[PDB]
Design a protein around this ligand. Structure first.
Ligand SMILES: O=C1Cc2cc(Nc3nc(Cl)ncc3F)ccc2N1
Ligand SMILES: O=C1Cc2cc(Nc3nc(Cl)ncc3F)ccc2N1
Ligand SMILES: [Cl-]
Ligand SMILES: [Cl-]
Lengths: 124, 4, 124, 4
């Protein structure tokens, strides 16, 4: 086509979606990771994660307001990945990289799994 | 704005 | 912080949100623009438009599944802006610029109003 | 991935 494109649009959209999350505006699901609870927007979770895409495209699961993750999932790892979904920034540290990578494999977030693998390889 |  | 950032994340999120819109997945509102109907995600509309942000933060309107726009709004202008919200690309043409600018003023989409004003000024 |  002959469209023009606003370079910062996608980043500005994501920033506003994170502001809605902050302010608990139109959040429509609670993700439970053992004793912790995280509120989010199903559409953002599906856009970032192959696991959430599969969950919320299922004709029964699409209607659930609570999703319980596998008990082996680390809440801090999940929190770091949820923040990445809404900001593009990943708080990857020596002390959390193993939990983050395991969580990203479970959630099916291939670019995160890729940077974790590279950071681990560099320390070996 | 740019030409994509 | 000491975060790393994935450059293409915001663009990839927006592309996936547009794929959900295409496929009518988790759309939760119908915008009516006279005889036409447009299905969308409230969160994407709020992230892009000051008018939708005000509508869906209202304690009564947040619960509506149908929103009727002012009868003066042009459906083609709205369609072009809805596509821009989900793609960052604006199909601005000599034949639609006046309707697009009027619609963007109503929807409170300041960057669009800005490029329309500039394109109009250049032709004068 | 970059240093933001
Ligand atoms: O590593 C990843 C990230 C990821 C996100 C999605 N999300 C969607 N995919 C499509 Cl094709 N349309 C809409 C979506 F919301 C699916 C798989 C995967 N795998
Ligand atoms: O030209 C524009 C585009 C636009 C979008 C929004 N959206 C939101 N703003 C904030 Cl601060 N937090 C969350 C949001 F969804 C508000 C006003 C305006 N004016
Ligand atoms: Cl990813
Ligand atoms: Cl805009």
């Amino acid at each position: 086509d002959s469209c023009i494109q606003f370079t910062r649009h996608a980043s500005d959209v994501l920033l506003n979606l994170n502001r809605l999350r902050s302010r608990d505006i139109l959040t429509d699901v609670v993700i439970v990771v053992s004793r912790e609870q995280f509120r989010a927007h199903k559409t953002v979770l599906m856009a970032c994660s192959g696991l959430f895409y599969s969950i919320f495209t299922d004709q029964l699961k699409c209607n659930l307001s609570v999703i319980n993750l596998d008990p082996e999932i680390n809440p801090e790892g999940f929190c770091i990945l949820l923040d990445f979904m809404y900001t593009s920034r990943l708080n990857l540290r020596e002390g959390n990289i193993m939990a983050v990578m395991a969580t990203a494999m479970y959630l099916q977030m291939e670019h995160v799994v890729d940077t974790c693998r590279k950071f681990i390889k560099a320390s070996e | 704005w740019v030409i994509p």
